[PDB]
Structure formats: structure tokens, C-alpha cells
Amino acid sequence: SHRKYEAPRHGSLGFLPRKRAAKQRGRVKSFPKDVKSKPVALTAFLGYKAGMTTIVRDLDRPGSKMHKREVVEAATVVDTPPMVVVGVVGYVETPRGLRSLTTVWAEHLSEEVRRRFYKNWYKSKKKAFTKYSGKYATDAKQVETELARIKKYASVVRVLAHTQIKKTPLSQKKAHLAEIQINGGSVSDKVDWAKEHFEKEVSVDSVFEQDEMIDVIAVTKGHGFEGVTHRWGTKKLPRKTHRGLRKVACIGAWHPANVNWTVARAGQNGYHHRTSINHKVYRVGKGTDEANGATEFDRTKKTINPMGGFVRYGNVNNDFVLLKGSIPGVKKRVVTLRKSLYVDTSRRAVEKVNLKWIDTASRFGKGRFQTPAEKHAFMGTLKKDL
Amino acid sequence: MKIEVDSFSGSKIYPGRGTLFVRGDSKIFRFQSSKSASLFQQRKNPRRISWT
Amino acid sequence: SGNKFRMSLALPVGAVMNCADNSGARNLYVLAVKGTGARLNRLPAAAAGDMVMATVKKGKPELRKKVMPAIVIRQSKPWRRRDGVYLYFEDNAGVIVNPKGEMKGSAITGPVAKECADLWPRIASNSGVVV
RNA sequence: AAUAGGGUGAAGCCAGAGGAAACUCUGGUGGAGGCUCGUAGCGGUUCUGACGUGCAAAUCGAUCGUCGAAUUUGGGUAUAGG
RNA sequence: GGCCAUGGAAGUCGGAAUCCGCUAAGGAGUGUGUAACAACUCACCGGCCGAAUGAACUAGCCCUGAAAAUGGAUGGCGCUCA
RNA sequence: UAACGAGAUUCCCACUGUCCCUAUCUACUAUCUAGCGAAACCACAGCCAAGGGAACGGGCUUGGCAGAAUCAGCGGGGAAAG
RNA sequence: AUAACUGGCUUGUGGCAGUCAAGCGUUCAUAGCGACAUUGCUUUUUGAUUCUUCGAUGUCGGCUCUUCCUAUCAUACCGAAGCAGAAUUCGGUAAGCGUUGGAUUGUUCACCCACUAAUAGGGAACGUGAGCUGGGUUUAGACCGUCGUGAGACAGGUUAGUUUUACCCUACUGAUGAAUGUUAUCGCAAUAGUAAUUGAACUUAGUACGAGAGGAACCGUUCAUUCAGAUAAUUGGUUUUUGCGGCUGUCUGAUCAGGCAACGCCGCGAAGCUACCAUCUGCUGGAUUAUGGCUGAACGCCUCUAAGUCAGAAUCCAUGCUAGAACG
Ligand SMILES: [Mg+2]
Ligand SMILES: [Mg+2]
Ligand SMILES: [Mg+2]
Ligand SMILES: [Mg+2]
Ligand SMILES: [Mg+2]
Ligand SMILES: [Mg+2]
Ligand SMILES: [Mg+2]
Ligand SMILES: [Mg+2]
Ligand SMILES: [Mg+2]
Ligand SMILES: [Mg+2]
Ligand SMILES: [Mg+2]
Ligand SMILES: [Mg+2]
Ligand SMILES: [Mg+2]
Ligand SMILES: [Mg+2]
Ligand SMILES: [Mg+2]
Ligand SMILES: [Mg+2]
Ligand SMILES: [Mg+2]
Ligand SMILES: [Mg+2]
Ligand SMILES: [Mg+2]
Ligand SMILES: [Mg+2]
Ligand SMILES: [Mg+2]
Ligand SMILES: [Mg+2]
Ligand SMILES: [Mg+2]
Ligand SMILES: [Mg+2]
Ligand SMILES: [Mg+2]
Ligand SMILES: [Mg+2]
Ligand SMILES: [Mg+2]
Ligand SMILES: [Mg+2]
Ligand SMILES: [Mg+2]
Ligand SMILES: [Mg+2]
Ligand SMILES: [Mg+2]
Ligand SMILES: [Mg+2]
Ligand SMILES: [Mg+2]
Ligand SMILES: [Mg+2]
Ligand SMILES: [Mg+2]
Ligand SMILES: [Mg+2]
Ligand SMILES: [Mg+2]
Ligand SMILES: [Mg+2]
Ligand SMILES: [Mg+2]
Ligand SMILES: [Mg+2]
Ligand SMILES: [Mg+2]
Ligand SMILES: [Mg+2]
Ligand SMILES: [Mg+2]
Ligand SMILES: [Mg+2]
Ligand SMILES: [Mg+2]
Ligand SMILES: [Mg+2]
Ligand SMILES: [Mg+2]
Ligand SMILES: [Mg+2]
Ligand SMILES: [Mg+2]
Ligand SMILES: [Mg+2]
Ligand SMILES: [Mg+2]
Ligand SMILES: [Mg+2]
Ligand SMILES: [Mg+2]
Ligand SMILES: [Mg+2]
Ligand SMILES: [Mg+2]
Ligand SMILES: [Mg+2]
Ligand SMILES: [Mg+2]
Ligand SMILES: [Mg+2]
Ligand SMILES: [Mg+2]
Ligand SMILES: [Mg+2]
Ligand SMILES: [Mg+2]
Ligand SMILES: [Mg+2]
Ligand SMILES: [Mg+2]
Ligand SMILES: [Mg+2]
Ligand SMILES: [Mg+2]
Ligand SMILES: [Mg+2]
Ligand SMILES: [Mg+2]
Ligand SMILES: [Mg+2]
Ligand SMILES: [Mg+2]
Ligand SMILES: [Mg+2]
Ligand SMILES: [Mg+2]
Ligand SMILES: [Mg+2]
Ligand SMILES: [Mg+2]
Ligand SMILES: [Mg+2]
Ligand SMILES: [Mg+2]
Ligand SMILES: [Mg+2]
Ligand SMILES: [Mg+2]
Ligand SMILES: [Mg+2]
Ligand SMILES: [Mg+2]
Ligand SMILES: [Mg+2]
Ligand SMILES: [Mg+2]
Ligand SMILES: [Mg+2]
Ligand SMILES: [Mg+2]
Ligand SMILES: [Mg+2]
Ligand SMILES: [Mg+2]
Ligand SMILES: [Mg+2]
Ligand SMILES: [Mg+2]
Ligand SMILES: [Mg+2]
Ligand SMILES: [Mg+2]
Ligand SMILES: [Mg+2]
Ligand SMILES: [Mg+2]
Ligand SMILES: [Mg+2]
Ligand SMILES: [Mg+2]
Ligand SMILES: [Mg+2]
Ligand SMILES: [Mg+2]
Ligand SMILES: [Mg+2]
Ligand SMILES: [Mg+2]
Ligand SMILES: [Mg+2]
Ligand SMILES: [Mg+2]
Ligand SMILES: [Mg+2]
Ligand SMILES: [Mg+2]
Ligand SMILES: [Mg+2]
Ligand SMILES: [Mg+2]
Ligand SMILES: [Mg+2]
Ligand SMILES: [Mg+2]
Ligand SMILES: [Mg+2]
Ligand SMILES: [Mg+2]
Ligand SMILES: [Mg+2]
Ligand SMILES: [Mg+2]
Ligand SMILES: [Mg+2]
Ligand SMILES: [Mg+2]
Ligand SMILES: [Mg+2]
Ligand SMILES: [Mg+2]
Ligand SMILES: [Mg+2]
Ligand SMILES: [Mg+2]
Ligand SMILES: [Mg+2]
Ligand SMILES: [Mg+2]
Ligand SMILES: [Mg+2]
Ligand SMILES: [Mg+2]
Ligand SMILES: [Mg+2]
Ligand SMILES: [Mg+2]
Ligand SMILES: [Mg+2]
Ligand SMILES: [Mg+2]
Ligand SMILES: [Mg+2]
Ligand SMILES: [Mg+2]
Ligand SMILES: [Mg+2]
Ligand SMILES: [Mg+2]
Ligand SMILES: [Mg+2]
Ligand SMILES: [Mg+2]
Ligand SMILES: [Mg+2]
Ligand SMILES: [Mg+2]
Ligand SMILES: [Mg+2]
């Protein structure tokens, strides 16, 4: 017999299996499609989730009841110090898919990126890339030959870049190394750009502009093993049910004499790889700017950091990106920021954002001050100040 | 945008922070956090709350 | 005649609110909410500015035992406005109206949510303080 | 042989008041009852709770009926398979 | 402008009639188009051309008729002058 | 039919997480370890679909397929056990 | 060797659909219907039978959850009308997507109130009891009515009546892992899965249409329903932070400072977790179905079709998204 009433299914079948990600660094499954006519430019950047804040902004949305009126919106801070270019990979179009042809590396690698290739760095002789560094001996013709091979045969050129994680407050010393696809220009142009950028820093302001829409690749928060009630949002069984109520009562019909793959079952929740799209860039801040949190209406000399620092992260002393809303991951997670895969002309995508004010009260409690000067002005002299 | 002031303690209210209570007599009350709001719903005297 | 943003629902089916107009009713018992879709076991629920089908549980005898439209004008469940402000009233109140949103009373006691006044010009006309 | 602590306030009795009388009223005192709230006790309503290869071949937890009598109970004794 | 109905319908609204004359040729009308006519077009007759043509029926294969629940069975693959 | 009722039934006030619609916390389990160490059950065993068949196959036929050793949960099946 | 669930054959009966076309439809058989007859399909009815199970397959209903069918209630695109508009009716491709909240009833069924785009019908051992519940039915106690001399009966009514076990195998959900020289980093992508859905308001516009009454639609704009995936700014919830303060009883001769009350109680309470009780995000190309066409024979005309060809659906395949074959 049929179900008494027709209700929608619990959960999405397009995010199965709900298993842990193979790596903690989210990987870009698909890059923006290459257009030769554009200039040579990067399509992605690596950052670290610092924390969330609040802004005030005047809305430009004709026909809305909040048009030209202040709205209060949640925002996410991504600490993004400039990345260092250390390598380049060539991809070839084959009848079996993309296949990596060659990887060319830079002469000098910093210690933070050479720690990426080790599980026990302190016990090692640190021999990685020493003979390869010797490959540059007084003519470096091996490197030029491989680069010419890439120019001759590669159809997709990607750069290898790593974060400068020593500039962040994280205690982790391993850098995060990723492939970032190069778009724009011919294959020769991409290869020349990659070679000429070896051992150089690339900033966020060269990849993302303000008011842009970008996508976020990250691994979500882990919750461990979870029951069906919270893992899948199933209905709780009555209070008086024997042997418990946080279950799915019927896990299958008599036939097929098996449990179906579509039935909600208890298991591991969170720590999934996710791609979240259409997050607007409200601010690309600079670490050298002493008015990160200042706007054109709030001229308080103020960094983006709240009072007492970001909870469980620290201070953002680098360039940063202020994104609208929420992005996947937890604090300190490595986050991949990717350019959008399509052209959005909606009023939400083309609106020019001008910020009024950014909240910098403490996130560690009911903070009520934006600045220590404001605090001591409100409370006056204390006993500890003498 | 405007900085608001707590009705019970004088604490500075920034956009979004705290709750806003409209009594039956349409008097508008502003609370910067749940702490002062909870005291007010207990009909405490802010004049006698030692930190307001 | 209006497009108000989503608000936290305050009055599920079975809730009894105050009747804030001088029509002679004192209670308004919610039995349905206009615009409620389908979801198994989920109760229809109304926010301020929502049209409701209601009966008068307490009031003049000629107002009792009938289904009539009403509009919620204030709610005690806090809800967030697009300016970030969380606000709530001291009580939940409504007024009896037509299917067109026209009041059967002629005055409103107490404040009215700006969400409700922005959506029903009839209730705005008869309203005093609007928050 | 055993049965915390409270509530209610029956007869009888004392004083005063009204009435022509027959009588009535008020304030106390008194401490009745297979009365009542409720321990121990005796019982075992509900969770159709726990457990349900148990601590246990009937228990455990909360909740509950009654709790000064047709009360509870030890021992001795009598009644024995149509 | 055949008639009667019908304001009128004159072929083209419903009824009648179902005629005659000439015509190789014309329905007292095929339709468009009209308030009706006009107007255009078909039955209809001819002028042109260079051998087929029209109607009804019969039965072979194929198609329609042909809608059920796990995914699935000419045994499977697959097969189209097989 | 007053009073009484762990009796059956309907409604109202208060209360409420019974529910909208779920969330959070504590102890003991579960979990891992040292030591100790049973029982039910057992033709052989253990992936599916269709066919046919004692008309609902783990085994047969035809297909899909198929790669050691494993852990915590789970309650579709073993037409599970009793 | 034989009756009460499911299952199997049948399909009278139940349900659904055809054929001819006497009639209905102001005229007019077939826009929409359609008698007398006649051909079928289905197994959600009930019969008929008794093949399997009586060294037992837990027999109603509801709750929960997944999936499938289409004879489509709504949503997409269209053809038809006795389609002027609006509305409505018939039909095609269509199961991608949705199909509700309640009063009474154990109910399935039913019937009302109400919202809604719609409140379609069904299957999977009449799905689903080592998932629950146990109101009904169907043990034993008891009451009533009728029947019986009686013990008792009732397919009549009523009340109270134990719902057991998973640690095995498989399967599902997740989690490790030997060996394919070792170890590390970055990758490719076969295959499998897949995601969005519907409504309202403004403008178009009191316009087209219409005597009037009435009254659309495309582009665009702002919101909302159901769903999905995240997130913890803010607000709310939670407190063994037993963090701070308060309170009672008792104990330490008093104070200070503490112990206990099977976390003693109360107010606040960060962090963490978490809520349509909070916020953010949910993409764009091709090929097609129905259908409407172009050229064009067959058949000197005609014809969307035969060869060839254009546009085109909530469909399909990609883009994108999830896993990464532990013998790629
Ligand atoms: Mg069912
Ligand atoms: Mg790709
Ligand atoms: Mg090589
Ligand atoms: Mg090579
Ligand atoms: Mg945890
Ligand atoms: Mg944790
Ligand atoms: Mg949980
Ligand atoms: Mg139970
Ligand atoms: Mg157990
Ligand atoms: Mg915080
Ligand atoms: Mg709070
Ligand atoms: Mg329900
Ligand atoms: Mg006297
Ligand atoms: Mg006296
Ligand atoms: Mg006494
Ligand atoms: Mg007492
Ligand atoms: Mg006894
Ligand atoms: Mg007991
Ligand atoms: Mg029990
Ligand atoms: Mg047990
Ligand atoms: Mg027992
Ligand atoms: Mg008691
Ligand atoms: Mg007691
Ligand atoms: Mg007793
Ligand atoms: Mg008693
Ligand atoms: Mg005997
Ligand atoms: Mg004998
Ligand atoms: Mg004998
Ligand atoms: Mg005998
Ligand atoms: Mg067939
Ligand atoms: Mg089939
Ligand atoms: Mg075949
Ligand atoms: Mg065949
Ligand atoms: Mg053969
Ligand atoms: Mg009772
Ligand atoms: Mg009772
Ligand atoms: Mg009765
Ligand atoms: Mg266990
Ligand atoms: Mg051990
Ligand atoms: Mg043994
Ligand atoms: Mg079949
Ligand atoms: Mg077969
Ligand atoms: Mg079979
Ligand atoms: Mg068979
Ligand atoms: Mg069968
Ligand atoms: Mg099988
Ligand atoms: Mg078997
Ligand atoms: Mg085989
Ligand atoms: Mg194994
Ligand atoms: Mg089983
Ligand atoms: Mg077993
Ligand atoms: Mg059965
Ligand atoms: Mg069957
Ligand atoms: Mg039949
Ligand atoms: Mg049949
Ligand atoms: Mg029949
Ligand atoms: Mg018929
Ligand atoms: Mg026909
Ligand atoms: Mg049958
Ligand atoms: Mg039927
Ligand atoms: Mg038999
Ligand atoms: Mg049988
Ligand atoms: Mg049997
Ligand atoms: Mg049995
Ligand atoms: Mg059995
Ligand atoms: Mg048997
Ligand atoms: Mg049986
Ligand atoms: Mg069974
Ligand atoms: Mg029910
Ligand atoms: Mg169909
Ligand atoms: Mg249709
Ligand atoms: Mg007609
Ligand atoms: Mg479906
Ligand atoms: Mg299908
Ligand atoms: Mg789609
Ligand atoms: Mg509804
Ligand atoms: Mg219903
Ligand atoms: Mg109900
Ligand atoms: Mg009810
Ligand atoms: Mg009900
Ligand atoms: Mg009921
Ligand atoms: Mg119905
Ligand atoms: Mg059946
Ligand atoms: Mg059944
Ligand atoms: Mg059971
Ligand atoms: Mg059942
Ligand atoms: Mg079962
Ligand atoms: Mg019963
Ligand atoms: Mg049963
Ligand atoms: Mg009985
Ligand atoms: Mg009889
Ligand atoms: Mg008699
Ligand atoms: Mg008798
Ligand atoms: Mg009998
Ligand atoms: Mg009976
Ligand atoms: Mg009964
Ligand atoms: Mg179990
Ligand atoms: Mg168990
Ligand atoms: Mg076992
Ligand atoms: Mg076994
Ligand atoms: Mg497996
Ligand atoms: Mg497994
Ligand atoms: Mg897995
Ligand atoms: Mg859409
Ligand atoms: Mg208008
Ligand atoms: Mg008008
Ligand atoms: Mg007009
Ligand atoms: Mg006009
Ligand atoms: Mg006009
Ligand atoms: Mg007209
Ligand atoms: Mg009008
Ligand atoms: Mg439109
Ligand atoms: Mg969620
Ligand atoms: Mg506390
Ligand atoms: Mg206190
Ligand atoms: Mg004290
Ligand atoms: Mg002590
Ligand atoms: Mg203590
Ligand atoms: Mg004690
Ligand atoms: Mg609190
Ligand atoms: Mg909090
Ligand atoms: Mg913490
Ligand atoms: Mg959601
Ligand atoms: Mg949205
Ligand atoms: Mg997407
Ligand atoms: Mg196209
Ligand atoms: Mg075509
Ligand atoms: Mg063709
Ligand atoms: Mg991989
Ligand atoms: Mg692999
Ligand atoms: Mg091999
Ligand atoms: Mg091999």
C-alpha cells in the first residue's frame, strides 16, 4: 500500500556519500573556462577563515522596500596574505581526459613550503628538491627544455602556489600548496607569465576586485557520528516509543529484501567537501592600511580585528577579503576562493557596494565598544591605571 | 546609522545588537544585551543596579 | 497590496490573540493562515501583517461563532528586520477586517508594527503609533 | 505482638441572652467516628517506565489505594484430593 | 434581386420547391463575402496537352487500438537484401 | 439518589516540549584497554534482477557482476529465534 | 488430505477503455456527449478455488520512511471547442516536481471546517510490530439485551486486560586496511549519484477583447511557499565554566573561609553547540517529445515526410556539484 500522505524526501541525493573528505584542503573540481582574448590572470587564491563580523550598507535595489535604506548583514573575514609562486604544471588534451605532462619548479623554495612534503620535518635531513635545485647549474637548460615542451604540447597551464602561513597567527608551519589555473592569453603567454613569476608574491588585489561574485571551496565542520534525526532531519518518534525515538521507524519495504541506498541511516556528519557559489566581495583590505575597519563615514582609525582578537584565530595582519554572508568551514580552515564560472548580470551581482561601518566589538562576549579609546572614554579611569 | 543607548544601563547599542521592546503603552525600550533585558523584565531598579 | 519580508512566525493555529479594535470583540482565535502551503504535520502559522481566518471567542454575542478574516498587527515573538533590529511587542493583537483588508471597527488600541501598516493602508489609517 | 504527626469537631457539660409559655439563640468546654490528610505498615492503579538469556521463575523506580480498624502480623492448632 | 418565411436574405439564415428556357455551358445554386446585393470561387461547360485513370472490395507484413507498480529479459549478446 | 471511587465518558480554567520542531546539558552504559567470561541458534551456507518451480530462491537456468583481513551502528531480509 | 492474512490461476462482480452510430446538442451523429448492441483491459473490490504454510510467515488501523506505477489533481510546452476576453471543457508529450492543517470516528472508508497551484488514484507479503503504539478484533474477569430448562450462545452492545530476543549472516550507513620497490606532494576522471520547487505583488493595464458587464499575456522589478547545502556576525535557547553573585537547613566555638543536602535552590552567565526562533548560497549550454513549419515527391495538383530540413517541454545528455575504481 502507498504512504498515507505524500511528503517530500529528507535530504539531497546529490551530495552522497556523506563521508569525510579525502583531504582537509578543498580542491577545485572545475576551473573557469579559458578565453584566449583575456589578459593572463589567476583564477583562484588560498586563504584562512578568520571569523565573522557585521556591516552596515545602503541598499541600491530599486523596487525594494529597503532601497536606499540601511541594511545590517553578516560578513566573513578571510585572511589572505600574498601567495608565493613556486611551480607550474602542464595539461594535455587526451581521449582519456586531462593528463599532466610536466611539472617545473622554481630554484629556491621557502622553508614553509618545503615542510609541505614532510610528515616528520624535525627528524629529516631536509633533502627535498636539492638535486632539482642543482638542475639550475649555470645554464638551466633542462628547465628551459621542459618549459618549451609545455609551450609546445600543453593546452591547459596551471601555476603551483603556496600560502605564506608563517605570516598568519596559526601555529601550523606547513604551507598549503595548490594548483591555480592560468587563464588568458596563448599557451606561450601563460608559460612566460608563470616562469617570470617564480619565487614572486602575488596579492589578492591581482585576483579579486571589490563587488565581484566569487565561489568558495572548503571542507565543512565535523560533527562525528550523528543519528538520523539531526543527520537527515527526520521526524522524531513519539515520546513513548520503546528502545528510543531518534530513529527512522521503517527502513524499507519487505521487498526488495535489502536496505535501499536512499533510506536515511546513522553515520558521520559534517567534514564534507563543498562548493558554495555567488558570495559577493564587500572589501579587499590591505594589511598595510591602518584603517581596515574604517569607512568613508566612520573615519575611526580601526583595523578589521574585533576587540580581544578573533576568537580562536588571532589578528588579521595581512591583506584580507570581506565576503557577504557565510562560507563553509571553521576557524583556521584553509579556504579556496575561486572566480565564478558564469556571467551574472542580476542586480545583486552588479550592485556597487559602499560600506558605512564595520562591527569591531568583541566576539568573545556581549562587547559594547568598538575601540579601547571608546571604552576608556565611556568608563573613565580605573584603579589599575593609577 | 545611529548609535543607540541602553534604557536600563546606558550601554552603547550598535546596529543589530540587543533587543528592542515595545511595551503596551507604546514606550520604546532598548537593551544592548540579554543581561539588562532580563533585569528589566524582573522590574529591577537601574538606579539600584551598581554598574548601570 | 504589498511585499513584506519574511518575519518570525508568532501565532500557530490554535493561538488566541487580543482583539485591538473597537469592533466589540476581545479575543481572536486563529484557525488558519492565508498563504500556507503543504507540509505534513506542520501547523500553519502567522506573523504580523498576515491575514488570518478567525472566530471571536470572547465578545458581543453577535460577533461569536463565525469565521471572519483578521490581520495581525503586533506579535510578542521577536523577529528580525532587514536593518538588523530584533523587536517584539508586549502582546499579540489583531483587528477584524474584510477579505479586502478593510476594518470592521473604526479605531485601534495600541501600537502597530510597521510591517503591518506598510502592507494594509486601511489599518495604517486607523492606527496610532506605528513601530 | 504492632500501628509518626496533623485536620474535622458527634453526644454530654458550663455560662450568658430572648420569650407569657412551649422553647430558641449565642460563646465556650468536651473529644465521637468501620471520618479525613499523611509515615511505618498492608496493598499493588498507571507509566501498558526499567528489565524482559533480569538483581529477581514476578523484581526495580516513580506514581498510587488504605493507614485505629471487616486493621496488620508471629507461633500453636484444625480442615486433605471429587 | 425566382418564391415563402423573413426588416430583407437577391443561391449561400430556416423553409420550400426541385421548374423552365436557352444553351457545348450554369446548382433556381459550392463556397468565400455580405445587413441584404454587388463582388469574387466551385460544381458545370468548354479552349490547351499526350496516356492512362477512378471507385468499391479481398489478404500478407507493418503501424494505431495497447495503462501498474524493484531494473530485466525472442534465454543473453545482438541481429534490418537478417 | 447526598456522600464516596487508582471505575467508564464529555467539556472548561490553569499548566504545559504531547505537538508546530526541534535544540542543549549531566551521570551510567554503549566505545577502547587489563583481568574474567557465558547463551540463543546452527542441513550446507550466505550479493542481486528476471524466468521457471510445491504458483514469493542463497543455491537451479539466463544475465548483472565479482579482489584479502576488518570496526562501530542499524533493524530490509534470513518467509530469523522462541 | 481442510477453513480463517499474504501469495498463485480466473475476472462472474467491481473498476477503466474502445467499435458501429439511433439520438442529445436552438440547426448539426461524433465541440462535448452518446442508447440498442458488441470488443477489450486491470487485479487497489468481492466472489470462485484450496496449490504453498497448521513440529506457527505475529492477523486491523495509525505513526515513521523509502521507492515505484499512471488510468495526471496541480505545475511545463502544446493541439481542439457550441475558445471574443476572463473562465472553462476535451485531448497530446508527460510521474521531473508537489499533492496540506484540523473537529467526530480504533477505524480503512466517510463527512464537515479551512488553507492551498492542487489538496489525484494506487503498488511494494492488503509495504512497514526483534520500528513503535495497542484504540479495534480475537482467551480467561465482569455488565446488559435477546436466545436456551440449563451448562452456555450471539458473526449484538459495554468495561479491564504482560506486545519478548540481534552480539550471527547478508544488506545499508559510515570507518580502517595487506599487497601489487618505499615514502611524500599535486593531480586526471571511468563509473555511480545529482536539486530545486511553486505562489504573490508592482509594471505591462483598466490596455488588448468587449455594446456593456467585465478583463488578459510577453520583457522587466521586488518578495514569498516547500525543499537542499552550509554558517554562528547578531538575537534567542542551552550551563559541570558548578564562572560570579544571592538564599535556606545543618556542621566546623565566632569571624574569615568552607563541608553536606543522591549536581540543595535562585539571578545572570561567556565559550561551545544550535533554530525558517537566526543568517548566507542554490549555475548555464546542447539535443529532443508533443506540436507548428520549410522545401518536396509519391499522385503533372496537393501535402511538415517519403529523401532532406527549421523552431521547440518542468523531458534527456552535458556544464556544475558529491564519491573517487581501495585490482583505473
Ligand atoms: Mg501505508
Ligand atoms: Mg571538470
Ligand atoms: Mg616520462
Ligand atoms: Mg616525462
Ligand atoms: Mg563534538
Ligand atoms: Mg569538536
Ligand atoms: Mg544530536
Ligand atoms: Mg512502550
Ligand atoms: Mg540492546
Ligand atoms: Mg561570539
Ligand atoms: Mg544569549
Ligand atoms: Mg499528523
Ligand atoms: Mg430570660
Ligand atoms: Mg448572645
Ligand atoms: Mg481527635
Ligand atoms: Mg495537613
Ligand atoms: Mg491482605
Ligand atoms: Mg510495581
Ligand atoms: Mg511495562
Ligand atoms: Mg536489553
Ligand atoms: Mg518476569
Ligand atoms: Mg500518596
Ligand atoms: Mg502513599
Ligand atoms: Mg486497600
Ligand atoms: Mg484515606
Ligand atoms: Mg483428586
Ligand atoms: Mg486417591
Ligand atoms: Mg475420582
Ligand atoms: Mg471422577
Ligand atoms: Mg502491452
Ligand atoms: Mg517493468
Ligand atoms: Mg530483447
Ligand atoms: Mg517478444
Ligand atoms: Mg533461442
Ligand atoms: Mg482513573
Ligand atoms: Mg475518571
Ligand atoms: Mg456516556
Ligand atoms: Mg553493542
Ligand atoms: Mg577487555
Ligand atoms: Mg554450546
Ligand atoms: Mg515484472
Ligand atoms: Mg530470463
Ligand atoms: Mg517468480
Ligand atoms: Mg512465477
Ligand atoms: Mg511472486
Ligand atoms: Mg533472486
Ligand atoms: Mg532459504
Ligand atoms: Mg550464474
Ligand atoms: Mg569480510
Ligand atoms: Mg530482520
Ligand atoms: Mg537469528
Ligand atoms: Mg502476511
Ligand atoms: Mg505479487
Ligand atoms: Mg472483469
Ligand atoms: Mg486477467
Ligand atoms: Mg464488469
Ligand atoms: Mg462503453
Ligand atoms: Mg468519434
Ligand atoms: Mg483478487
Ligand atoms: Mg477496485
Ligand atoms: Mg490444500
Ligand atoms: Mg488458502
Ligand atoms: Mg498455519
Ligand atoms: Mg507465532
Ligand atoms: Mg516464528
Ligand atoms: Mg515452519
Ligand atoms: Mg501465517
Ligand atoms: Mg518474519
Ligand atoms: Mg491518525
Ligand atoms: Mg498518459
Ligand atoms: Mg493533460
Ligand atoms: Mg457551431
Ligand atoms: Mg520522482
Ligand atoms: Mg521513471
Ligand atoms: Mg530540471
Ligand atoms: Mg496547507
Ligand atoms: Mg485531509
Ligand atoms: Mg489529527
Ligand atoms: Mg483531535
Ligand atoms: Mg484526529
Ligand atoms: Mg479521534
Ligand atoms: Mg478525495
Ligand atoms: Mg490484493
Ligand atoms: Mg499487512
Ligand atoms: Mg513487537
Ligand atoms: Mg501493524
Ligand atoms: Mg519486520
Ligand atoms: Mg484492547
Ligand atoms: Mg497486534
Ligand atoms: Mg473476556
Ligand atoms: Mg438464537
Ligand atoms: Mg420466549
Ligand atoms: Mg431465560
Ligand atoms: Mg461457536
Ligand atoms: Mg461480545
Ligand atoms: Mg475493549
Ligand atoms: Mg535491537
Ligand atoms: Mg536492541
Ligand atoms: Mg546474537
Ligand atoms: Mg547463528
Ligand atoms: Mg558491502
Ligand atoms: Mg559497509
Ligand atoms: Mg563508504
Ligand atoms: Mg525558478
Ligand atoms: Mg485595475
Ligand atoms: Mg473598469
Ligand atoms: Mg471598460
Ligand atoms: Mg475597443
Ligand atoms: Mg474599447
Ligand atoms: Mg457577447
Ligand atoms: Mg468594473
Ligand atoms: Mg509574465
Ligand atoms: Mg541546517
Ligand atoms: Mg545554575
Ligand atoms: Mg535569591
Ligand atoms: Mg545560611
Ligand atoms: Mg559532611
Ligand atoms: Mg554540594
Ligand atoms: Mg541522605
Ligand atoms: Mg538565561
Ligand atoms: Mg548564548
Ligand atoms: Mg569550547
Ligand atoms: Mg533551510
Ligand atoms: Mg532565496
Ligand atoms: Mg549548482
Ligand atoms: Mg535549441
Ligand atoms: Mg515533425
Ligand atoms: Mg524525415
Ligand atoms: Mg583522487
Ligand atoms: Mg585510487
Ligand atoms: Mg587485475
Ligand atoms: Mg590489473
Please state the overall shape of chain C, judged from the principal axes of the Cα atoms. globular
Biggest pleated-sheet summary of chain A: 6 strands, antiparallel
Strand count, sense and closure of the main sheet of chain C? 5 strands, mixed, barrel
The percent range for helix content of chain A is: 10-25%
Structural class of chain C: mainly beta
Distance from first to last alpha carbon of chain C: 19 Å
Classify the beta-strand content of chain A into a percent band: 25-35%
Which structural class fits the helix and strand makeup of chain A?
alpha+beta
Shape of chain A: globular
As an assembly, this protein is: part of a larger assembly
Termini distance of chain A? Answer: 82 Å
| Rg of Cα set of chain C | 14 Å
Number of DSSP E strands of chain C: 9
Instruction: Spell out the helices and strands of chain A N to C.
Output: EEEEEHHHEEHEEEHEEEEHEH
Number of helices, counting only DSSP H or I runs of 4 residues or more of chain A: 7
Strand order of the largest sheet of chain C: 2-3-5-6-9
**Overall radius of gyration of chain A:** 25 Å
The counted number of beta strands of chain A is 15
Q: What's the tally of helices of chain C?
A: 2
Family (chain C): Belongs to the universal ribosomal protein uL14 family.
InterPro entries (chain C): Ribosomal_uL14, Ribosomal_uL14_CS, Ribosomal_uL14_sf
Organism (chain C): Candida albicans (Yeast)
Pfam families (chain C): Ribosomal_L14
What does this structure look like?
Chain C: GO terms for molecular function: large ribosomal subunit rRNA binding; metal ion binding; structural constituent of ribosome. This is part of a larger assembly, with chains A (386 residues), B (52 residues) and C (131 residues). Chain A is an alpha+beta fold. Helices cover 12% and strands 27% of the residues of chain A. In chain A, the strands form three sheets. In chain A, strands 1, 4, 5, 6, 7 and 8 form a six-stranded antiparallel sheet that branches. A six-stranded antiparallel beta barrel of chain A has the order 2-3-13-12-9-14. Chain A has a two-stranded antiparallel sheet with strand order 10-11. In chain A, a hairpin with a 6-residue loop joins β4 (83-92) and β5 (99-105). The relative contact order of chain A is 0.22. By secondary structure, chain B is α+β, with helices and mostly antiparallel strands. Chain B has one helix at residues 34-41, and strands at residues 4-5, 12-13, 19-22, 28-31. The radius of gyration of chain B is 11 Å and the shape is globular. Chain C has 131 residues and is mainly beta. In chain C, 8% of the residues lie in helices and 28% in strands. Chain C has a five-stranded mixed beta barrel. Chain C has a two-stranded antiparallel ribbon with strand order 1-4. Chain C has a two-stranded antiparallel ribbon with strand order 7-8. In chain C, β2 and β3 (27-33) form a beta hairpin. The radius of gyration of chain C is 14 Å and the shape is globular. Chain C starts with 10 loop residues before the first strand and ends in a 6-residue tail after the last helix. The A-C interface holds A 5, 7, 54, 56, 65-66, 69-72, 235 and C 3-5, 39-41, 82-85, 118. β3 (19-22) of chain B pairs parallel with β8 of chain C, so a sheet runs across the interface. The structure holds magnesium ion (132 copies). One magnesium ion is lined by residues 29-30 of chain A. Chain A binds four RNA strands through β2, β3, β4, β5 and β7.
